[PDB]
Amino acid sequence: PSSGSSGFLDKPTLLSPEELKAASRGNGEYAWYYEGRNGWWQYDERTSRELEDAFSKGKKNTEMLIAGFLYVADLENMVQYRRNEHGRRRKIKRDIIDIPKKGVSGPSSG
Numbered sequence: 001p002s003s004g005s006s007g008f009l010d011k012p013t014l015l016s017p018e019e020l021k022a023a024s025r026g027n028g029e030y031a032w033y034y035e036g037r038n039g040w041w042q043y044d045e046r047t048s049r050e051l052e053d054a055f056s057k058g059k060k061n062t063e064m065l066i067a068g069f070l071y072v073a074d075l076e077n078m079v080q081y082r083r084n085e086h087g088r089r090r091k092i093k094r095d096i097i098d099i100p101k102k103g104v105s106g107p108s109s110g
């Protein structure tokens with residue numbers, strides 16, 4: 001016996017199933033982002049680990065604290081909003097780190 005429900009599934013794209021998997025498995029890292037004024041900006045490692053655990057637990061939305069506010073992170077539509085707000089919402093996403101050249105170096109003697 002077997003099923004398509006025995007594995008994970010990704011959001012839509014213009015790429016292929018062998019591209020999305022390769023972008024992830026080529027490093028095995030992860031990060032979360034949200035749309036600010038000038039583009040996508042990364043969450044704190046304190047915070048993004050809570051978002052990363054929520055889709056792994058099975059919940060459809062989780063909660064997080066910031067500079068002075070509680071934001072509800074919805075995993076279904078990939079957005080954030082305040083607990084009292086039903087309509088107005090800001091975009092979030094998952095992404096992967098590629099690692100800089102600073103990750104490669106010689107022996108401790110030089």
Ligand SMILES: Nc1ncnc2c1ncn2[C@@H]1O[C@H](COP(=O)(O)OP(=O)(O)OP(=O)(O)O)[C@@H](O)[C@H]1O
Pocket residue numbers: 034037066067069071080090
């Ligand atoms: N995902 C987030 N992580 C951390 N801080 C956030 C996040 N979303 C909002 N903030 C910050 O919390 C503060 C208030 O956010 P709020 O959503 O009220 O801003 P806003 O006035 O609606 O912004 P804008 O109209 O520019 O989108 C701002 O300093 C904002 O950058």
